[PDB]
Each structure stands twice: as structure tokens, then as C-alpha cells.
Design a protein around this ligand. Sequence first.
Ligand SMILES: Nc1ncnc2c1ncn2[C@@H]1O[C@H](COP(=O)(O)OP(=O)(O)OP(O)(O)=S)[C@@H](O)[C@H]1O
Length: 279
Amino acid sequence: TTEIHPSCVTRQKVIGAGEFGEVYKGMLKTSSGKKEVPVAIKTLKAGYTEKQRVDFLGEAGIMGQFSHHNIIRLEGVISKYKPMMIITEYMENGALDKFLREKDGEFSVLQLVGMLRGIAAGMKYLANMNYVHRDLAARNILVNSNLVCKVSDFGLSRVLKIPIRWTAPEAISYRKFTSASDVWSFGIVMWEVMTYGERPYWELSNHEVMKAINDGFRLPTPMDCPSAIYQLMMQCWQQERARRPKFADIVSILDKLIRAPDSLKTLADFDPRVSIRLP
Ligand SMILES: Nc1ncnc2c1ncn2[C@@H]1O[C@H](COP(=O)(O)OP(=O)(O)OP(O)(O)=S)[C@@H](O)[C@H]1O
């Protein structure tokens, strides 16, 4: 990571809150003053514990190892001065789940699939770098003004509480977190994207979600969802982890679909939950 001097960072506005309250949008002066880039700034408030510092700076240490279009860029950190700060590229549309919920129905199928391809490319890179994310969910994807989606929030990532309904069965039960359990999570992210940010499994409790999954039941198809896309998410949810696609398979399949876009016009049947009978 690069150590940034506080004189090079301005905080302009509050853009969201998180674990280490809070997150600002600001500007970062770079290249000895010739360049100026918009940034997000996460701060660690005074009184933090040793664990909190290890987790806070560890996230930046992980992010700083990566250089990929679909992974949030770390500009640098302020650790020599307080409060400590992690400074990342600014993503104008924030978290993907909240963004889609505010854009319900407004994107095309091709656009949604392109977002998933970007996420998959970032995850393929991450897994190939020998990391497991463990917390892959649309809330942890960020979106810029150009609709590019980037993996973020590496607080739980590791080199080789987590929300149950994004987590593969073997990671829930045995704490066996691998790229294959991340593939399960990616399948849930596919469902989140295609539904414009619906809550996986709706009103089911965590125990009810585990009951359904272990009985072989899976999330139903989203409305207006290409058959190939639903088939792919179903494969990500294979009980046996060795049967799930690898991230390289996911990227390749999504690429083939995007480049032959009539392939996305064959839709999976949306199951009529509600019978409305008219003439
Ligand atoms: N680079 C960014 N660009 C724009 N907004 C960001 C950026 N980073 C974080 N945020 C905002 O800050 C929110 C908090 O997410 P993060 O701080 O990345 O995760 P976190 O610190 O683990 O907090 P939680 O508890 O997961 S929301 C994000 O959901 C966005 O609302």
C-alpha cells in the first residue's frame, strides 16, 4: 500500500455508513500535485482496539495486492496520522443491491448480464490470486457512473458472522470456505441482480433457508430471466462443491451469451405464484 499524507486528502460529503463509521466522498491529490481524483474515504475512529486495527489495515493490505478492472482500486492509506483512513476509487452509484432497488426494471437483460460478467471477472481474478472472499453479495459490489461493477469489502477475505443465505452449505456447517463456496455466493448474486435486489428467500428465516436448501429446493427463477442465466445460477448451487462451475467457466459462459445475444431471448418460465383470472 501507499502511505498518503493528510494534506493531500479533502473530505467533501457523507456517502454512507459502515462497520468503521463512517464513509466520505472526497478528493485525493496525486502525482505530486498534478492529478486530482475523486475517492471514497473510510475512517477508523479513535479508541479502536488492536483487533479493529488489524482488520481495518488488513482489508487495505488485501486490496493493495490487486490490479483488476472489476476490483475496487486502493489509492492508499493514512496510518501514520489519526484518524486512520482507507482511500479507494469513488464509485458514484454506491452499493449494487441498493442501486438496483432504486432502478427497478430500468435496465435491459443484456445490461444485467454484463454486470454479472464484470463481477465474475473480478471474482475469477480474486480466486486465482488465492483469496476467498467469504462475503460475496450484491451489497459488497460497487457501481460507478458507467455501470461498471467492482468487487469490494474485503474485511472478511482471507488467503487460502457471515450471512447464511449467501453461504454454501459446507461453509455454513464445516467453515470450509473456498472459491467453490464463493461460487455458491455468486449464484445468489446472480439472483439478486436479475431481481433488482430482492431479498434471497424473502421472508424465510435462516433456519428455514437451511431447511429448504438441504432438502434440495432452490431459489425460483426471477421474472424476465434468460433460461441460460437461471441454469447457470442453479449450477452454482450444486450441493457437491466439486460439481459447481469454476469462476473461469462462469466468465466463459457469460461471455459466449453476451456475444450471441439472441441466446438470452429464451426465457425460463416465471412460476405463476399468483393466479389472476380475466376474460
Ligand atoms: N469506494 C466507494 N465508493 C462509493 N461508496 C463507497 C465506497 N466504498 C464504500 N462505500 C459506501 O460505504 C458503504 C459501506 O460499505 P463498506 O464500508 O465498504 O463495508 P463495511 O465497512 O464492512 O460496512 P458494512 O457494515 O459492510 S455496510 C458502502 O455500502 C457504500 O455505501
